């Protein structure tokens, strides 16, 4: 086992839940009101956080976070989610997309 092979699982890992939040996210675009949808956005951000955290990778890990927060509020009910809420969940999500395809680069 070597960090370069573990940093090999970490992106393949972390492109399933990038997969997942896609998948999620246009369903929950045809009902915003999606409360599981909404949940199911949540759990695959919080778990990106902590795999982040766990290679020490401070920013994904703070970008994350700050998304998370976004559906968190959403799963609350403290925001709404709007087309313009939406364009910013799925900004982060590309960036995160790109944050990957840079370890392996």
């Known amino acids: 086992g070597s960090h370069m092979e573990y940093l090999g699982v970490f992106v393949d890992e972390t492109k399933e839940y990038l ?21 199911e956005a949540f759990r695959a951000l919080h778990t990106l956080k902590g795999m982040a955290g766990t290679m020490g990778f401070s920013s994904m890990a703070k970008l994350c976070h700050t998304l998370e ?4 509020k959403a799963r609350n009910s403290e925001i709404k989610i709007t087309s ?4 910013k969940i799925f900004a982060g999500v590309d960036m995160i997309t790109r944050m990957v395809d840079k370890i392996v680069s």
């Open 19 to 39: 997969q997942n939040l896609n998948d999620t996210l246009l369903e929950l675009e045809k009902n915003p009101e999606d409360m599981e949808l909404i949940n």
């Open 84 to 87: 313009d809420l939406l364009d």
């Open 69 to 72: 927060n976004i559906l968190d």
